[PDB]
Design a protein around this ligand. Structure first.
Ligand SMILES: O=N[O-]
Length: 151
């Protein structure tokens, strides 16, 4: 889906995330939950987080942030050749977690937002184009498996 140039940008940007995977993960999930509270309802382990202060204080939210972004980082490093890596996540998110694809669009928007917020002026126009394309590629492939499943 992406040029070599663009994957190079993606993985350069991802270097920022890897310097603090838990901090980026936490902010991504906070941005997701605060912006779209219905998403929090999908996590019976975060459902108790009534306030953003409680979210910020939750070490388990940070932990999940690390899981989510580690899984994404793994995927991104495959530069689109990610069928094996994406399959179980499509299946778990459609069949077990019941996550509509729209919420994957929300978390993609949250990643772009967090990158800007944590790295203002350091996440260039090209970098945003490339990262956006990578996230859409990820979403588009998840969506194909959701359609296979009828979800
Ligand atoms: O936070 N997505 O598992």
């Amino acid at each position: 889906g992406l040029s070599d140039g663009e994957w190079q940008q993606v993985l350069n940007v991802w270097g920022k995330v890897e310097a603090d995977i838990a901090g980026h993960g936490q902010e991504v999930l906070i941005r997701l939950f605060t912006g779209h509270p219905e998403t929090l309802e999908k996590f019976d382990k975060f459902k108790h987080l009534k306030t953003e202060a409680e979210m910020k204080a939750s070490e388990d939210l940070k932990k999940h942030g690390t899981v989510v972004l580690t899984a994404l980082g793994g995927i991104l490093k495959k530069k689109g050749h990610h069928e094996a890596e994406l399959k179980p996540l499509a299946q778990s998110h459609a069949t077990k977690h019941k996550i509509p694809i729209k919420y994957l669009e929300f978390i993609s928007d949250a990643i772009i937002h967090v990158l800007h917020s944590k790295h203002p002026g350091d996440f260039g126009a090209d970098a945003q184009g490339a990262m956006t394309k990578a996230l859409e590629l990820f979403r588009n492939d998840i969506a194909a498996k959701y359609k296979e499943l009828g979800f």
